From Swiss-Prot:
InterPro entries: Aldolase_TIM, His_biosynth, HisF, IGPS_HisA/HisF, RibuloseP-bd_barrel. This is Imidazole glycerol phosphate synthase subunit HisF. It is an enzyme of class 4 (lyase). Keywords: Amino-acid biosynthesis, Cytoplasm, Histidine biosynthesis, Lyase. It catalyses: 5-[(5-phospho-1-deoxy-D-ribulos-1-ylimino)methylamino]-1-(5-phospho-beta-D-ribosyl)imidazole-4-carboxamide + L-glutamine = D-erythro-1-(imidazol-4-yl)glycerol 3-phosphate + 5-amino-1-(5-phospho-beta-D-ribosyl)imidazole-4-carboxamide + L-glutamate + H(+). Belongs to the HisA/HisF family. It comes from the Bacteria. The active site is at E10, D129. Its main location: cytoplasm.
Amino acid sequence: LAKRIIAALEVKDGRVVKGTNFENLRDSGDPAELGKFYSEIGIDELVFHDHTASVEKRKTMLELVEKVAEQIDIPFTVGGGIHDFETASELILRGADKVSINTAAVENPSLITQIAQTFGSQAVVVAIDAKRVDGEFMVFTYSGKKNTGILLRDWVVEVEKRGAGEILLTSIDRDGTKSGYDTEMIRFVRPLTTLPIIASGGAGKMEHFLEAFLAGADAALAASVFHFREIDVRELKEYLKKHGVNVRL
């Protein structure tokens, strides 16, 4: 099955947060320029997660989307504080291919269906942040601050029922570490859904990507390993292809 390598760019006020090690760029903090660069070195898709203050957030995210869309021809997803249909709609119309929803989806699962009814299931990425609590995988909202008491098992099934197109599955246990993707979590989710699963959290070395794909991920997302050039994207794809993973070269 075909596998995707996805770069996540954390943004705020139209700037990439903590930038990159790429000396070749005019501006290593320019999300559009960085996105273009990633598409040229072989990234399959981009995910932008915005952290801009409330007063300028809506306009800032729309400007980001417009600027990014001019520079790239590969799919991109935008998210971070999308709480209703109109916000999602404006972002897709302005150029995003997909939107990520998380806290708002948990609080109002019909939001998934609402977006999907106009933009198709393929436009809706449900980001699920999960962690082990007393031996069970639980869903967390508010940037991992709130244990919802909802079992990951139940939420995955509901997300697909509501019409999501893809699940962006972040293990809070691994996110920010470089210890590996949470392959147990990925394997737990795999049989519960037909949807593409984007593995997120824990990437540290090329072998972690192989492990994630063996676990049943359809895509693997990473940020700082790419931005700080711990992993070269071309080298990663060549590595994965060598070991039998169907990646696009």
